[PDB]
């Protein structure tokens, strides 16, 4: 299969521009385009994407234009400017998949054997990871459940080539928060981590609600992986762990003692010198 897909700034800015371009006049639930990328090991790197003429019916979920010849010659010209980038995957902005989408992926498979689809929810500006990646799968499920032409999640992340990195940093400069952020950014990051953990746990709650209540099918998979997660909790307060935790915390405490004491000493040294200097000025003035 495909273990990872990394997404560069250029494709996400291009799809944002495409969404603003289409929604400006032809506001529609989604826009569809084609990604370009390269293969390292079994990871995929995607930095290029172009909009393709697309249309979806509102509810028929079987009626759709994706332009064959436009896709082909646009790819040809993008190869002319840069030949490394070949067709991998297709993007859309709809926050939800459709029954119509797997046909889009099957068409895209004509141009790439393992074409991967990417949802880029431009409107959300939220907790994290605005890109979702999915591959096409067809297997017997090994458990007696009926097989089906299915989309399967593949982990995704954002990574930048150096030129895109300087480009993005320059635009972010004004709103940019510092990378180090000694105490403020770190504490805010921990609070945001608690926020994200709570949000994910509440999502897992809602899934279990829907599963127990029956409105959502039991995946059998993941839920047993979730049970492994639940058995993976470390169970602190076991005695030797408590001893080790106390030891390491005390080491941190003595270290921070040294730092604070030195800070007090330097503070006093500045204070005494300031008093001496201002008193010297006062004595000279008379």
């Amino acid at each position: 299969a495909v273990q990872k897909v990394v997404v560069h700034p250029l494709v996400l800015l291009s799809v944002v521009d495409h969404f603003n371009r289409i929604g400006k006049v032809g506001n529609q639930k989604r826009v569809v385009g084609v990604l370009l990328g390269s293969w390292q090991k079994k990871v995929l790197d995607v930095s290029n994407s172009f909009a393709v003429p697309f249309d979806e019916d509102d509810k028929d979920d079987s009626v759709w234009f994706l332009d064959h010849d436009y896709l082909e010659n646009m790819y040809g010209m993008f190869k002319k400017v840069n030949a490394r980038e070949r067709i991998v995957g297709w993007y859309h902005t709809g926050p939800k998949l459709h029954k119509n989408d797997i046909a889009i992926n099957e068409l895209m498979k004509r141009y790439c054997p393992n074409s991967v689809l990417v949802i880029i929810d431009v409107k959300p500006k939220d907790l994290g990871l605005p890109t979702e990646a999915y591959i096409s799968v067809e297997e017997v499920h090994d458990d007696g459940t009926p097989t089906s032409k299915t989309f399967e999640h593949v982990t995704s992340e954002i990574g930048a080539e150096e030129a895109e990195e300087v480009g993005v940093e320059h635009l972010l400069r004004d709103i940019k928060d510092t990378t180090v952020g000694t105490l403020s950014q770190r504490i805010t990051n921990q609070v945001h981590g608690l926020k994200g953990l709570n949000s994910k746990l509440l999502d897992i709650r809602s899934y279990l609600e829907k599963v127990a209540t029956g409105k959502l099918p039991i995946n059998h998979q993941i839920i047993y992986q979730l049970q492994d997660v639940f058995n993976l909790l470390p169970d602190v307060s076991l005695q030797e762990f408590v001893k080790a935790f106390y030891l390491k915390t005390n080491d941190q405490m003595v270290v921070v003692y040294l730092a604070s004491l030195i800070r007090s000493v330097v503070a006093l040294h500045n204070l005494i010198n300031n008093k001496i200097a201002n008193r010297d000025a006062e004595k000279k003035e008379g």
Binding site: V254, L258, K275
Partner: protein, 157 residues
Amino acid sequence: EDVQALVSGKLALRYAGRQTEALKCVAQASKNRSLADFEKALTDYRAELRDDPIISTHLAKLYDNLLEQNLIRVIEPFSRVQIEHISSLIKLSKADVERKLSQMILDKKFHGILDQGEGVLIIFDEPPVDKTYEAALETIQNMSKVVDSLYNKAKKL
């Protein structure tokens, strides 16, 4: 092994006697690491090994070294072990083994601690001193020095 190969040498054969056989059996003791037979060799040949100052000094050094090596060999599989048991394994009396272990631990050549009230020795894990705290102590002592320096100041107010 070379010892038996030299007592049989063409020049040494004319000198065979108590002195030669004493070192022969001492060498045999060294080969099989038998402290009991080592001391037996040191005992039978009193006039051959004790009164000779160089022989006596070096052989006592060798016996001490072999005792330390065998003690380290036998303590290794233990965390807590009765001194009686190790005395039985070493064939030396507990009165000697206890003093030897005390001297060895005192010299820090071996990590372990005795308790006579239980008649046991204990093996521990010797934590690696944690240089952080020594650096801490030197820093705070030097901050005390600079504090005295500021005390030298502030008299100018």
